[PDB]
Amino acid sequence: PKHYGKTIKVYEYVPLLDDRNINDQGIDASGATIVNGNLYGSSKDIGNITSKLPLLTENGGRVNRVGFTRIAREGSIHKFGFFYEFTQESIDFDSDDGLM
Amino acid sequence: FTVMTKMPGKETADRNDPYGETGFSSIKWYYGILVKRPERLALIKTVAPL
Amino acid sequence: PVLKVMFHKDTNVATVLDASGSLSDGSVEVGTFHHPDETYPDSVTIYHGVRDLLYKRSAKDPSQTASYPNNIINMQVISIDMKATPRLILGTALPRVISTIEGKDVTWHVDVAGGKAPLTYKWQFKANTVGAAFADIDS
């Protein structure tokens, strides 16, 4: 719509387990703070999955935390044009009708 | 899956945090397995090309 | 393994480090506890032990002790940094019973994760005869 500049922005939402999800809200299963918010990224090693597995007892409090992240994109607009010029004597005295 | 959600406000007010600006949501479940005949499963371990 | 806890009042950080270790950041010693609980090895993790340790100490001064109303009971602000060696766990365990016939090769495999680095292994064997004790297998 008019009166909004020349650009458009949108939001993409990154999944929980993707590598792009980076933040400081992670808390490890032991309760100690951990650098990674997501449990494990796009990692298919069995060792990482085995080590970082959520675990709780019957009464559970403050064990495992996660976080989320979003990204944005953009687009823009340009303009083009061209023209041509003629004279009346050309169209009147041309041997070809319907040149226009 | 069992999910519990408590939005911030009056319900989250507590003696620790009288204002109750905070909130949380949690998920929990159980899982187990029993294997009757392990001889039926098979596996071939190998390297893979780049 | 016994663990030792340090608390920094300004940053609200509780540091768990090995018994021989020490910190020069200005924290004070709150107490000590066993990471694998002797009575309940699997029911209690580090967070519960740190909470029980910090319950006793006083809010205004981490060195001194006080009753309930002046305790350190809010663990939403408290953050825990682990500096001690990770606990040894048995990812793969030996089968309880192995059956075979004479003249066939038998293989035992065990997988251990955690600990320090130069984890070693030693295997021991006992006979079925009465009054027999574990004997080292000659490497």
Swiss-Prot record, chain A:
It comes from the Viruses. It is found in: Virion. Assembles, to form an icosahedral capsid with a T=9 symmetry, about 60 nm in diameter, and consisting of 535 capsid proteins. This is Major capsid protein. It comes from Enterobacteria phage N4 (Bacteriophage N4).
